[PDB]
Amino acid sequence: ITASLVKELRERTGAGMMDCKKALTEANGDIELAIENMRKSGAIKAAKKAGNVAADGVIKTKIDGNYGIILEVNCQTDFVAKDAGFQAFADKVLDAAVAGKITDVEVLKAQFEEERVALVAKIGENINIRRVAALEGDVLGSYQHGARIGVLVAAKGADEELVKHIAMHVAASKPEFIKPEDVSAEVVEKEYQVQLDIAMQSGKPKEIAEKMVEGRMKKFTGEVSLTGQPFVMEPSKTVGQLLKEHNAEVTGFIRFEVGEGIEKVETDFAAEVAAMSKQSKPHVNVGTIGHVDHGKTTLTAAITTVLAKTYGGTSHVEYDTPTRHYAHVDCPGHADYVKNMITGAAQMDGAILVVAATDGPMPQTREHILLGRQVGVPYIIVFLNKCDMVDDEELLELVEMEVRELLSQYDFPGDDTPIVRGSALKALEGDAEWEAKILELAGFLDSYIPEPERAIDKPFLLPIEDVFSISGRGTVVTGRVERGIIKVGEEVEIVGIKETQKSTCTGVEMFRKLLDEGRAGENVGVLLRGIKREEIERGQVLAKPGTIKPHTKFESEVYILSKDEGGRHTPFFKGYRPQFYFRTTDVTGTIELPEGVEMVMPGDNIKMVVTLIHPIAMDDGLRFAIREGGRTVGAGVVAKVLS
Amino acid sequence: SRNSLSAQLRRAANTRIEVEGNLALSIANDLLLAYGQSPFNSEAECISFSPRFDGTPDDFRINYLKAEIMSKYDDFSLGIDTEAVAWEKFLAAEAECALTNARLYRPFNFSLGESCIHMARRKIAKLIGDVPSVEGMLRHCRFSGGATTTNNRSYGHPSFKFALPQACTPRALKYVLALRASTHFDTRISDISPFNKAVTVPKNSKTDRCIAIEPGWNMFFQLGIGGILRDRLRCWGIDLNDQTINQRRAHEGSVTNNLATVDLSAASDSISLALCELLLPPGWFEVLMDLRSPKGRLPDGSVVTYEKISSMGNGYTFELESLIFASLARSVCEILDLDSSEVTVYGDDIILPSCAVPALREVFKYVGFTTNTKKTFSEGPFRESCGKHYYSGVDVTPFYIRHRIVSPADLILVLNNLYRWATIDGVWDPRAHSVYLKYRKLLPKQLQRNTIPDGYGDGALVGSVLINPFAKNRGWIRYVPVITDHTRDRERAELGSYLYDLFSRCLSCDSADLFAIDQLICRSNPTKISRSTGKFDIQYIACSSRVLA
Numbered sequence A: 001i002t003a004s005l006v007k008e009l010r011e012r013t014g015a016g017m018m019d020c021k022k023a024l025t026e027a028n029g030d031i032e033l034a035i036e037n038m039r040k041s042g043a044i045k046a047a048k049k050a051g052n053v054a055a056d057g058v059i060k061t062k063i064d065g066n067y068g069i070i071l072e073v074n075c076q077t078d079f080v081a082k083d084a085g086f087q088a089f090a091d092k093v094l095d096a097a098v099a100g101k102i103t104d105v106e107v108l109k110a111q112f113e114e115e116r117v118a119l120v121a122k123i124g125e126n127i128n129i130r131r132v133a134a135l136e137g138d139v140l141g142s143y144q145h146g147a148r149i150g151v152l153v154a155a156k157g158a159d160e161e162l163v164k165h166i167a168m169h170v171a172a173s174k175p176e177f178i179k180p181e182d183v184s185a186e187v188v189e190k191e192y193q194v195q196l197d198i199a200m201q202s203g204k205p206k207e208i209a210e211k212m213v214e215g216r217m218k219k220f221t222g223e224v225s226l227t228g229q230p231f232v233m234e235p236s237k238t239v240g241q242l243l244k245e246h247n248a249e250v251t252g253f254i255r256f257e258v259g260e261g262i263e264k265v266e267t268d269f270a271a272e273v274a275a276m277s278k279q280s281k282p283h284v285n286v287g288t289i290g291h292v293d294h295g296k297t298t299l300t301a302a303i304t305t306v307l308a309k310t311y312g313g314t315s316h317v318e319y320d321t322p323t324r325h326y327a328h329v330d331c332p333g334h335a336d337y338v339k340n341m342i343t344g345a346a347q348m349d350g351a352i353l354v355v356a357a358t359d360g361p362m363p364q365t366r367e368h369i370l371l372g373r374q375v376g377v378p379y380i381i382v383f384l385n386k387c388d389m390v391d392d393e394e395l396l397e398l399v400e401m402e403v404r405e406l407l408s409q410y411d412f413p414g415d416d417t418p419i420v421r422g423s424a425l426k427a428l429e430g431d432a433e434w435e436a437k438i439l440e441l442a443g444f445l446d447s448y449i450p451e452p453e454r455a456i457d458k459p460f461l462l463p464i465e466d467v468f469s470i471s472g473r474g475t476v477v478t479g480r481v482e483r484g485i486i487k488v489g490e491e492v493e494i495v496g497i498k499e500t501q502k503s504t505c506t507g508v509e510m511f512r513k514l515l516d517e518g519r520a521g522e523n524v525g526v527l528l529r530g531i532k533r534e535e536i537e538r539g540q541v542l543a544k545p546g547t548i549k550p551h552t553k554f555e556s557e558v559y560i561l562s563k564d565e566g567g568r569h570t571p572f573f574k575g576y577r578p579q580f581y582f583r584t585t586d587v588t589g590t591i592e593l594p595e596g597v598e599m600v601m602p603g604d605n606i607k608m609v610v611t612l613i614h615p616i617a618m619d620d621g622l623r624f625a626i627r628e629g630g631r632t633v634g635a636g637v638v639a640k641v642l643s
Numbered sequence B: 001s002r003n004s005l006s007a008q009l010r011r012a013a014n015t016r017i018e019v020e021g022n023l024a025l026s027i028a029n030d031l032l033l034a035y036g037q038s039p040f041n042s043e044a045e046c047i048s049f050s051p052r053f054d055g056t057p058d059d060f061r062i063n064y065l066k067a068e069i070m071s072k073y074d075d076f077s078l079g080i081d082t083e084a085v086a087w088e089k090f091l092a093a094e095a096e097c098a099l100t101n102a103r104l105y106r107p108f109n110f111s112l113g114e115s116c117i118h119m120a121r122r123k124i125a126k127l128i129g130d131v132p133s134v135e136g137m138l139r140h141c142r143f144s145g146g147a148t149t150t151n152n153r154s155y156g157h158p159s160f161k162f163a164l165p166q167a168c169t170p171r172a173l174k175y176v177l178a179l180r181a182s183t184h185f186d187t188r189i190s191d192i193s194p195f196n197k198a199v200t201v202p203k204n205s206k207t208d209r210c211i212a213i214e215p216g217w218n219m220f221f222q223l224g225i226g227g228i229l230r231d232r233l234r235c236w237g238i239d240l241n242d243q244t245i246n247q248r249r250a251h252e253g254s255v256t257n258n259l260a261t262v263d264l265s266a267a268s269d270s271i272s273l274a275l276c277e278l279l280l281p282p283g284w285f286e287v288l289m290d291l292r293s294p295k296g297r298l299p300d301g302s303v304v305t306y307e308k309i310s311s312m313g314n315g316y317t318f319e320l321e322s323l324i325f326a327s328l329a330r331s332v333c334e335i336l337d338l339d340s341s342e343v344t345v346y347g348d349d350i351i352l353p354s355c356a357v358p359a360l361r362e363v364f365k366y367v368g369f370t371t372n373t374k375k376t377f378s379e380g381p382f383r384e385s386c387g388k389h390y391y392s393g394v395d396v397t398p399f400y401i402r403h404r405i406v407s408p409a410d411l412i413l414v415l416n417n418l419y420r421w422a423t424i425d426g427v428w429d430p431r432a433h434s435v436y437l438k439y440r441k442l443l444p445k446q447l448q449r450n451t452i453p454d455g456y457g458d459g460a461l462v463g464s465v466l467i468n469p470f471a472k473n474r475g476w477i478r479y480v481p482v483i484t485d486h487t488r489d490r491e492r493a494e495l496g497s498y499l500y501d502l503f504s505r506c507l508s509c510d511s512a513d514l515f516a517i518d519q520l521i522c523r524s525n526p527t528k529i530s531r532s533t534g535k536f537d538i539q540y541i542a543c544s545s546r547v548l549a
């Protein structure tokens, strides 16, 4: 049983490293029997994962003429939902449902159970076909809002685009029924006999409560039915009114949303770490990413434990080395991390990719790495976990190399990536040989991730909040020094909104003292030579000359608040025109949506190309808010400067 | 030749509501009739009707609206001189403190009053320390936006307080001088005088309210004291920035009957010099004495030498009375073996266990406060605190018509208050609806249809924004026109504005997501001065419609 042979069975199988070593053992060096043994042992592997909650996955729709299918397939993480192999499975299932008009979920399940088991075998998450449904009508339309929401709509006397718009509406407004009358009339007469008790306790006349409940029940029934809902593309009119205008009729509709009605058992990363932990200067932000079973949480508890033991001391964890303070988050979800990054709730300086050496990279491991690329994480360090459960050291080298090449495929320095070979379990138990690996990993955090740049070390910048003309002295701007240092006698530029102007700092001032300089963090008045008050305005910045430029057009990564986060409750579309808040002021802009995106819902992550009415000092990384009349409804990060 | 909706709306907003008689009274009487209550026979009945604290909540809720709704109407013809009535009370209270000052500075005999003073003195000292700290004064001193002896309302903005030299009392001079020494900017004093200015503002139809307008530098330092007290009171579970605490405790008391709400009959003018000296550490008392105005000038030119420590317009009065009432209420609790954390205060508004009330009344008599038995509730189904009123858990907060209804904006305010009082979740009580629709007809046609959702002010009728023909969705944001006060720009004091800014920025279940986002927004706003002309304008604001069920 050579490492070379195990490798052979690996790329033929996709099964974990040790699974191959083992199966190549009880089958002798016979690769073919090994294939069969593992393929046979798949059933139990899938059976073991079967207890795992799986609330992620995809919705799929497909229309062929007047017959349409909508399908849900689940998994554990959105990383796996994005994976090509998972996607292939679901598309295959979907295609089979359409071709054989299969609407019985059990026939569907039973027909793909072998592939499912084989897919769970190599992906390592509990994957399941959940539900499947079909819809027919004169005209069929569909809308996918990413992977999460699928809609089928059947109509009559309506054209293709009308149906598409209705589907988009259904996706956003979730009607339960078509028309108010359709509401299970017996399910609301109990709620009307429940409601009028509530009302009739004030001692308020019989007639009053009944009459009020009746009126309440009427609009409650309106909002839950298509017909009664404000059309999302024109809220001043209901979908019912829209339909009459087109002499059309909605026949039926189906809305699936991934995970609908499945528990939703949230996780407390920090506490799970502390729990696990018990039974057993520069500030740097890091995060763990990797497969659900590969011990990210165990590793984190081992890190906190060993570092505390050795050095003494947004659900996050904290730990210190002699030279650094670390904040540590987990990255279980792609969309979730992207959103945290955009809003500034989270921001990695480095990532720790956790791979169990017992398996080696999973298929979704590229998705884990691709996330790093997408949010532009500068550095990735690898922790190879469960190394105590691996006998042959040359197999460890096999895994190492697989990881390095994956990293290089996505433009990380695979060949120069620090890779620690450790054991979170063994270190957490107290075996010193393994604790040494934890310390080694912390050594790499210290050495491989550069200390992020301090504001005081950046070129001078002060966002201008107000401008004054002091008789007998001259012009003064006020603000908080955002970065760098401004000294009396130095030249400055006034950047943004207007043509750039130049001036000279003739003084720096606080309420109690005149100063020679202003430094990052400090609130000050900066006196300027020559320039007049009416030549400056809020929204411009003071900067060291040449260090920042004004721009009108940029690419951005944007998060749109959900209703509950106090943002919008309706979607917007192509010509959305809100205010963009940069540092001290709102600026009006227009957006271009990405190719193929037509609707944006509250709670969405989305990239937009923004064009501002006038220029604004900015560079890559500048965060901004999106506003409607002073109310914040979104947040953005400038990703690339354009025109 | 251009009647845009915007011009049409402005024209409508600038008309007068034309009606015979007292419109306010007519609205209230139609409302009573619709609920099956007898109408007000005369203007005199409006202000002298008492409700009965029994019946179903429905019965009580309208009955209480009846007792309150015209309680504060300021345009009756009853010949009541509400200013003279106020000055009468003002002299009486001052005479009251005179007696208190003498009795309290006057020599085994045993007493609840003295015992509570002894206990409160010790507890206040642990809470607030020996003397106001430099750090606290540095953090909390500031100018307000109100009038001072040198600045009338139109010059009330803080920028004008730095721009114009303010007055100060003799004892406050050294504070100003210490301020002056600490900065290169110059701080000017207009005059040194021991007088504040006493005046009346409206309260209800029977009487005005007396207040004082302080010398501006005194105020500047009073606010420092006020700020420090507000911080320290948090250690007694009292948050003077949050009225909802008392509101909830009132509701609770109306259900459990274990909490009492106690109203103090404008005893914000009965806090005697003597009581403060007995309760406060000497370092604090000296400072309070330094910063108060010892004398007042009345509107008629006569002067007063104050027996009370200070009055409503002083920048530490609200906090000082909170401290004083709280400390006494908490000592009464200790004396009775009640938990003193059962005590909450918000200025005049006191909440404590119903069992403590009789003892509290005795202590209050002894320290020169006069408890209003009619507005004190320690049994029965009714409680009231901090603007909220409850009857057996039911919100029965009334609304008030304060002024002659003249313009469409006045009528819209009244109709919107009716809406908020008479709806549940946007659904009308049919009894009130009929009155609402009737009086809505008095509005110019366009303003009858121009609706906004609740929570957007009163520049338009609260209703459904999606049926508003004047609302316009532009770039996926809906904009709605609302009525505003028409204004004209004034020039700001340039140096005064600069000092205000420089002084302010140098004096210094949330999700992590919207917390970092909030950090983005700069909270300072440039000084901008306006004068309102009395006419009305129209402004488009961004609106979100009510959410679906």
Ligand SMILES: C[C@H](O)COCC(COC[C@@H](C)O)(COC[C@@H](C)O)COC[C@@H](C)O
Binding pocket: B131, B132, B133, B134, B137, B138, B141, B174, B175, B178, B179, B182, B287
């Ligand atoms: C000079 C200054 O920066 C520090 O103290 C000033 C002062 C602090 O309050 C002390 C308190 C009343 O016990 C008043 O001190 C004057 C006394 C000693 O008569 C007030 O500080 C607030 C200003 C400076 O914004």
